[PDB]
Amino acid sequence: RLSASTNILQSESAVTQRRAMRLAPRREFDANMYAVDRERQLLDMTLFGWGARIWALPIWPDIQLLHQPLAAGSLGIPCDTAGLDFRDGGLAMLRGEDAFTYEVVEVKTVTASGLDLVRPVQAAWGTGSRLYPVRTAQLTEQPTLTRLTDTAQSARVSFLVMEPSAWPELMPATTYRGRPVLEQRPDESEDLTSSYQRLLSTLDNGSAIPRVTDVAGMALPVIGHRWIGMGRAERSAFRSLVYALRGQQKPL
Amino acid sequence: EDLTSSYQRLLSTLDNGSAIPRVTDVAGMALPVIGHRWIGMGRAERSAFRSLVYALRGQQKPLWVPTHADDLTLVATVSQLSTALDVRNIGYARFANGRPGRRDIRIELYDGTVYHRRILTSTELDADTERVAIDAALGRLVEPTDVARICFMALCSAASDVVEIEHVTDSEGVATAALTFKGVRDDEF
Amino acid sequence: TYFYGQGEIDAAPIVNGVLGKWRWIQDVSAMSIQLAVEKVEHKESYSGQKALVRSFPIGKTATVNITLHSIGPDNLALTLYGKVVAKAAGSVTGEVLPADLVAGDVIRLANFGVSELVITDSASSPAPLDPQYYALRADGAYGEVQLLGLPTPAPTQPFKAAYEYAATKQVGMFTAPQPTVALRYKGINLAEGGAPVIVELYKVATDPLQELALISDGNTVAGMQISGGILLDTSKPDTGDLGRFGRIIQLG
Amino acid sequence: TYFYGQGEIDAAPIVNGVLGKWRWIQDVSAMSIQLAVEKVEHKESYSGQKALVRSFPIGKTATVNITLHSIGPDNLALTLYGKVVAKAAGSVTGEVLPADLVAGDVIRLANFGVSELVITDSASSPAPLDPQYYALRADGAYGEVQLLGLPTPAPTQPFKAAYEYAATKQVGMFTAPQPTVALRYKGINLAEGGAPVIVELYKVATDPLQELALISDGNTVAGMQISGGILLDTSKPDTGDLGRFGRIIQLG
Amino acid sequence: TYFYGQGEIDAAPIVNGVLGKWRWIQDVSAMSIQLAVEKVEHKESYSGQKALVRSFPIGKTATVNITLHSIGPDNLALTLYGKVVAKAAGSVTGEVLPADLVAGDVIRLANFGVSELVITDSASSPAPLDPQYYALRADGAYGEVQLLGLPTPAPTQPFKAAYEYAATKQVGMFTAPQPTVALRYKGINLAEGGAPVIVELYKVATDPLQELALISDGNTVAGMQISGGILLDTSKPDTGDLGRFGRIIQLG
Amino acid sequence: TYFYGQGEIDAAPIVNGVLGKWRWIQDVSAMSIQLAVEKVEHKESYSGQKALVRSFPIGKTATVNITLHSIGPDNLALTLYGKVVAKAAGSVTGEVLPADLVAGDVIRLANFGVSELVITDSASSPAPLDPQYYALRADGAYGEVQLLGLPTPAPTQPFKAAYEYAATKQVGMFTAPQPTVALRYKGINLAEGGAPVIVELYKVATDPLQELALISDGNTVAGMQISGGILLDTSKPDTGDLGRFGRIIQLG
Amino acid sequence: TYFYGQGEIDAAPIVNGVLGKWRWIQDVSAMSIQLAVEKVEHKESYSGQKALVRSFPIGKTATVNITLHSIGPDNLALTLYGKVVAKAAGSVTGEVLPADLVAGDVIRLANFGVSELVITDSASSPAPLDPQYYALRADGAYGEVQLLGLPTPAPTQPFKAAYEYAATKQVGMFTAPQPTVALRYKGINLAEGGAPVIVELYKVATDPLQELALISDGNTVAGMQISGGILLDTSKPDTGDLGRFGRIIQLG
Amino acid sequence: TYFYGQGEIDAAPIVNGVLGKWRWIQDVSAMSIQLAVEKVEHKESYSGQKALVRSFPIGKTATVNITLHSIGPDNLALTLYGKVVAKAAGSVTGEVLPADLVAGDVIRLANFGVSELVITDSASSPAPLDPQYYALRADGAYGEVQLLGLPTPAPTQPFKAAYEYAATKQVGMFTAPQPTVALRYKGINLAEGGAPVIVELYKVATDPLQELALISDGNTVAGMQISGGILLDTSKPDTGDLGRFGRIIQLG
């Protein structure tokens, strides 16, 4: 979930002034998880002691697998960084089959082919170990753990990132009258709706009969849109478009 | 019916302004919440449950509510006089080192005898094993093969005063009810 | 110790709880008793399996199905929620037939089993019509009279018909309340040389017939299936070992 | 005391509550009557056996299914919600045929059973065309005429056809309101030497035919199945023993 | 290494957890054991193939179905939730028969297997009725007596009947709590020259019979089907290799 | 008065309401008409039965199913929502075959019915290849050409193929709007000596084919099943007894 | 290029990921592999048809079903979630039989395969009972001892029984965790002269047996059906063409 | 005008929209094409008959099912979402066999089709073992070798095996993306003397096989069933008569 604040006030005529407040939208993640063998007790203790405090949440959607083994003590992890949530001076977190097989390192810069590192890695993981971008996050609400058996608990964990998420802002290539044009064709899987919202207030319903006065006499249509990614490039382009929109501020 | 456990905290005062939010732990303590269900199958059990409900007087009277998990498992036998219980590393030392909500142990041996202990302090020994301590003695030498569970205990009281006793068949029959217990700081401290 | 049962069935209506007069239910082809019990289960979780540990029955009901091939009026009353009506044989003298009658029309009389049919012509001088000018379809089993012809000097159109009707038994539809009948079965077990076996059902509430094929195709006698639930009788002793639904007696 | 019934069925349409004229529904292959009752159950809990203790009926309905093999216009009107239309035999003198006709075209006439077909050429001097130049398909029963050839000096294309058409009976579809018919089944029970049995149904609301296979395969005659619900007649006495849905009469 | 089993089944009722006395359940035609397990599945998304990666069982249950052809009172008590009742043979001296009796009436006695029936006339001078004036139906097995005639000087209507009744065994219905039986199947595997095989079931909770056709058609013996769930015994050692639900023993 | 129908069927497309040119639908194996009516019921409660008292039809719809065995292009257009395309026979002179051709490869031509195939080698001096070095699979029914061999002095790889193609008829998929066709059936009733019977359906909307087994197994001719709903025609008189869905004509 | 497979199957348990020792699964009658894929569809709407335009698979799972006819203890352990227990042959000296023993009772010994049975009477002077006073049902295959009679001077009731028992193999119920077994199939293809074909499944999770007919009717060998899902192995190379579920090898 | 089709099917994989090289899918037993259309219905109420009056299609889809009996590696790759892997024949020199071997153990080699097997003893002086001391099961097709015996002076347990392995073809499972294949059915209509018929399908998305019985029972060859949906091709002209889903060509 990408959320931003933009309080807009319109006059009697259908004219709007927009005052986008948040430059960096707050990011929220919602997911479900399980814990059975040695992860349930660890999860219980982890949410018991640490509780409501800053985490280092790996970016699950940005999962990545190493193509070559990483030598212990090596400086630099050559891996794909095309359209990934990797930033200079950020964090990275390797992972293994189990929760414990992990280690966090600090990334200096992105070379488009690797991750420059300042501190050498103290343990070598071969091909198959997962690589996760890391962003600071906090538990918005403590999960309600559902006991499935003697040792089993499913949780609905929700996280909010407490760091700005920089990302390039790009608009559609086509331009019309000096403004962007949305050339993407919406998905028709779910039937969509269109409505003509009007500033038709002041119905003045008394006792005999009502009467409506067109304050502006203009109709502003409303259109719904849906799309499917099917790839990394399309998702990155959509994220760039969302960032460029800045909520309701930027029109197109 | 699958039940749930949650760690309610006095985590108010989020102070969400315009730039970013920040949360301050007013007390830095977690009080667990546990749900409970039972079946009567008889008059005596129903009478006992009614007596317990009357004794509770809502949330006023507290009482320990042992969990039924397997949080801790032994990895090495312990002598009767020893107070150095060894359990596999679960980050207990980093998170649990003696502070209300944690601690308290129920051995629940295979035969049926259960020993109630009190954790004193946990020290990290290895990436896979620990040497968590206890208060006094164990009772006998118990091997890892002769332990069912540990099921961390915790003092709690009712979370909702209203109790629904669903009578199904008859007094000499079966009844269903649901109870919820929440941790509370009591017992002279 | 093997069962292959044949025998008879006796039913006694229950009218406000006072036992009625037992009667034979005539031929029967199939009798089945079904028992259904609902249970609530308790599951432990100390073994890590969450397997079923205990279960106590809460529901208890018994259903009985009977297939009878008898279309006797008593069975019709018991099965169609009807009550038998007996009409004594008699005579009619002044029935008026439909007017505007011509050859080819069919007339229907209010009574069945018509015989000695006479049709007197309406005039100052009565003149019974000739028998050869009318015919009785189905030998007067339904009072159906067919006109063969009329004399060239067309007589007075309205007619006065007199005849005799036989006694009959009638059963209405849904004209009686839900019968409550106790059942006694008289199965002889052939597998043990014809060993007597007794089954008694104290209280049974029947369900109206499901289907009745008036016109049948094949070599199968028409069948009547009745479903009923065995109610709990509150008059019998509770601690008595005989129970309150039924019981079975096997001499030996 | 056994039933294997065959016989006749008679119906009388009910219009505005006044009895109509009874008619035979022609051959019928199957008739069945089904009774349905809804019950609300009361239970008592003193025994701890959680079992049924009383039940009182609430719903009361009956349905009748009839399979007739007659496609007569009267039965068609009864089943298709149609009204019979009688067209008298007549003649046509100046019917205009389609233009731009050529050999191989098939022309269709507005009436069936065409005979003495005459096609006059359009010209100042009438000149009927040679019969050899056209043919009648299906012996002119379908009103279809086929062109066999045209003279080398092509005559005037528009044509005037005169012929004779026979009388016919038509039935509409959904052109009549829901018929309400009283049914009188008069069957013979062969199991008792052919004993007489009568079934009376005061008010029946029919349902249009479910299927009608115009092109049949095999050795089975086309069947028409009609379903109907026996309504409650409000004119018969409530305390009358004859009931209000139907009745059965047996002589004995 | 192939199985085709035949043999015997023994059951021991479990009361308050103390083992009962084992007994044979008489002939049994079919036994089957079914295992059901519920599983919660964990998946990993790094491959983009959205496929299953791990699964851990949660539920664990077992059910046993048994088809017995024995209608013995002990098996009836086991299956009908009844308790056997033994009635010793005895005599009756002053049973009063219904009044207003006439020829053709059928009277029923409270006991079966009647013999040496004597009916004394009610009068100052006792006068037993002639045996020729009454008959015993079904050889007095159903306790039914039919009147063949009465003397012209009609004797006193009320009657006193004295006779002898044989011993009988009765079974109640739903008069006993849910039985808990331990089953021991001892079968012979013919596929291995008749090798010995034993199956042990510590705790089984049965379900009453589903159907019981008292009047059977065909050449198939009446069958009693019983379903039951194998509960978890809490007395056996948890680490014991023998388990807690059942066991199989094979000699080799 | 009995029906066993065989005959033909005629269909005329409706394009904006103007009647089209009737055409025969070729052989047909099964035609069925189904009528469905929805009803709303009113229930009295004065008799204590709450039985159905009245019911009036609210819904009315008719569905027609046809099974045709003809794969004629006209029927394909009517059934596949397609429009026929006619390609006249012609010749080709400069088609270029795929390069890098070797023995064992199969070449496919854009047209079917190839004959007089000639392949001219690409060079300053044209040199048609020897016919024995290629073969025509399926006698040129698909332009499939197989290379038998190549001369040791490998000629210029690109080839120029010329040939003649025959005329053909093509049908697209979903290339036409929902057809609306009036149907006229010409059933002859054999049960009455071949009595003509007419059925006309004014407006019918068809549904595309459900299945088409291109490769069939057995001795059954491929069948094509089409479903259609009879719409309500608004042009016919409302009070006219002929109705608005269809009608049936039976001479007599 | 045609398949009709017969052969053998090998299974190796996976215990914490380390390959186990392969073993033959004995005779097998049926093996099936099912693939299920879930897809999300994208629909365009520019053509007016809203027809499916694109679809990408999101789900992927494979299920394998095996039917084995072997009741070997290893297969029982693999299928019943059990672990084999081996008991060595031995002897007993001081078993105490139930008291209050009389003729007709049956005694059961804790061990099977009893031989050389001796029952010593309890008294100051031991006096082994005569063998003719007891019998061994099923030749001591279950330790079932039947009392034929007792001496007139009733000896001391408690008995001390000594005998020898043979070794046996036992399998518990649900006494082992969910097995994870890799499968190797050795199908020989008869359609190609017995061409070898290999199928390997890296990781498979089985499901307990669905049914087990201990007493079978007919001429069919008892069958054991097992269902399992093929998990995704994370150890194999991702880019390796061998995949992660399984693979098939066909020499040629 | 009748269809009974047999013939060939050709497929061309579609990669990034560029046509691939067509290939034969080997023998095919059944092909069927199904059309589905969704419709929204409009009704008019002026008649009071509440019946359908208009309907316009909304949905448009098509699916194709194909049953192929070929297990060729190319077809396996097409259906199993796999990619063929070719392994060339080679040799092994220093493969190490498992230790702690004893007579009766079965060892497996990493390659199939083993020949010229040589096992050298581990010692300072190499000493190949006698061939009589080991055997090859299934003629070394499964890479299985069985130990027949060992010399009394037990040689060094670890062994070095050298042999030759033949070439093989492998297919992965779910190792390839959803194939998109264009299908060309070329069948012969026997009902018209073997007339030519062609069916074209531009774009088809397949679904993995549903079932694959490796061990077959009976006389029926193993069948592979594949389902696929015909997508909408966006490259063909919209107004083009050939459509965008498929086509049928008939010569005439």
Side-chain angles (χ1 to χ4, degrees), chain C:
Chain C
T1 53
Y2 285 84
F3 183 35
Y4 201 82
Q6 306 267 324
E8 299 181 292
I9 286 164
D10 298 325
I14 307 296
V15 185
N16 203 126
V18 67
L19 277 296
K21 292 284 138 47
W22 290 92
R23 68 175 199 77
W24 184 33
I25 197 164
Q26 293 101 334
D27 217 343
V28 298
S29 62
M31 183 177 176
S32 298
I33 304 101
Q34 277 167 114
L35 322 179
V37 169
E38 171 197 353
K39 312 189 296 324
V40 161
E41 69 275 16
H42 177 72
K43 295 173 176 307
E44 292 287 44
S45 162
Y46 62 76
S47 77
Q49 314 181 4
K50 164 156 177 64
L52 172 59
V53 59
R54 308 193 90 268
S55 180
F56 174 91
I58 79 178
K60 64 200 262 173
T61 187
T63 81
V64 62
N65 290 318
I66 301 97
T67 309
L68 58 91
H69 293 290
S70 177
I71 191 71
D74 60 354
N75 293 9
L76 283 169
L78 179 138
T79 302
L80 295 182
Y81 283 17
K83 63 177 46 162
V84 183
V85 176
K87 179 74 140 190
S91 177
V92 188
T93 195
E95 270 174 72
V96 167
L97 274 67
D100 291 331
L101 183 63
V102 305
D105 285 343
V106 65
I107 308 84
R108 327 199 179 292
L109 276 43
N111 294 104
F112 316 101
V114 306
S115 52
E116 319 178 27
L117 183 64
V118 305
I119 299 95
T120 308
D121 186 74
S122 311
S124 179
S125 176
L129 262 65
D130 291 331
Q132 69 273 15
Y133 290 169
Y134 70 79
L136 287 169
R137 295 307 212 162
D139 67 32
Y142 316 104
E144 290 175 355
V145 187
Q146 179 41 54
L147 272 288
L148 173 142
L150 279 183
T152 296
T156 304
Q157 189 75 238
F159 295 158
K160 294 140 180 167
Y163 59 91
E164 74 173 2
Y165 54 70
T168 192
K169 280 160 97 184
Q170 311 173 358
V171 177
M173 65 182 179
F174 298 129
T175 61
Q178 184 179 13
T180 308
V181 291
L183 277 296
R184 170 199 275 220
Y185 172 60
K186 282 154 293 305
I188 56 169
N189 183 5
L190 304 169
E192 293 292 331
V197 172
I198 299 314
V199 191
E200 85 189 355
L201 289 64
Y202 310 108
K203 205 152 151 212
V204 182
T206 80
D207 302 299
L209 193 75
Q210 303 114 320
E211 182 155 280
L212 180 59
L214 298 175
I215 297 181
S216 295
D217 189 358
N219 59 4
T220 72
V221 183
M224 303 204 221
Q225 194 148 3
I226 297 164
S227 176
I230 302 169
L231 311 179
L232 189 82
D233 198 278
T234 75
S235 177
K236 280 72 177 177
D238 306 319
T239 65
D241 303 279
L242 76 166
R244 275 177 281 203
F245 288 97
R247 65 182 180 179
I248 196 165
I249 306 95
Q250 175 152 4
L251 78 176

Side-chain angles (χ1 to χ4, degrees), chain E residues 4 34 49-50 186 245-246, chain G residues 58-60 142 173 211 218:
Chain E
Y4 194 70
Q34 283 105 330
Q49 307 169 35
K50 59 175 75 70
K186 183 174 174 66
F245 287 94
Chain G
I58 79 178
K60 64 200 262 173
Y142 315 104
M173 65 182 179
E211 182 155 280

